[PDB]
Design a protein around this ligand. Sequence first.
Ligand SMILES: N=C(N)c1cccc(-c2nocc2C(=O)Nc2ccc(-c3ccccc3S(N)(=O)=O)cc2)c1
Ligand SMILES: [Ca+2]
Length: 223
Amino acid sequence: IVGGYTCGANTVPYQVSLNSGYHFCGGSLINSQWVVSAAHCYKSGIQVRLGEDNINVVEGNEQFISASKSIVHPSYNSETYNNDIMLIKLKSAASLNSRVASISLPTSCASAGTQCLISGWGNTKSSGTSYPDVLKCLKAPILSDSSCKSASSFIITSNMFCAGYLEGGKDSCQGDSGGPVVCSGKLQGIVSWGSGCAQKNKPGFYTKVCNYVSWIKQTIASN
Ligand SMILES: N=C(N)c1cccc(-c2nocc2C(=O)Nc2ccc(-c3ccccc3S(N)(=O)=O)cc2)c1
Ligand SMILES: [Ca+2]
């Protein structure tokens, strides 16, 4: 997260870090045994870390649980980025409290101009690089489809939406992926991609969770 702020210890209790020996992607907890993330974040043998703040220091409210299974969406196309969503099942349920809590799926898609909360432990730097210890946060507006389409030369599909600021400066970044975009207390987005980070006329792009609510529920129920 570039141009953002330190969220505060456990203020975003649905934020989850996916760890493969090190932090590498975030997710969102949708219920006590299911985490939503990005399909491009798939890795075998993931450990999912709940109640994290400082990912480098053991602070007392962490829960480390192993991914039972990681279910990439069937039409995820690693090359085009379309359907960049995945569900991770945990081997055991997380124990839910004030610092570990699930986020609601949307009932309808969020409208352009909605202010949302984006968070993660990804790059915070303007130009050059730096990864924070504690969780970063960003409030950013969903931009319009016609604004997003003109903003890129990669092919945008109807399973993506863009959010952030056209002037650059404020954006999700590398290591944020798979993390949440929450709008009006609903999980509307998954950090998916962007052309660099916080660059002018290059806003962040997000999996449009609202198109996948049925697939999520059916998947959770079948497994
Ligand atoms: N700016 C962001 N919000 C953001 C978020 C996560 C990662 C990165 C990022 N930080 O550094 C690079 C990044 C990146 O995503 N590069 C990138 C650009 C385009 C695509 C892509 C998009 C649509 C279609 C096809 C492609 S692809 N696979 O052909 O390149 C994939 C990755 C930036
Ligand atoms: Ca910690």
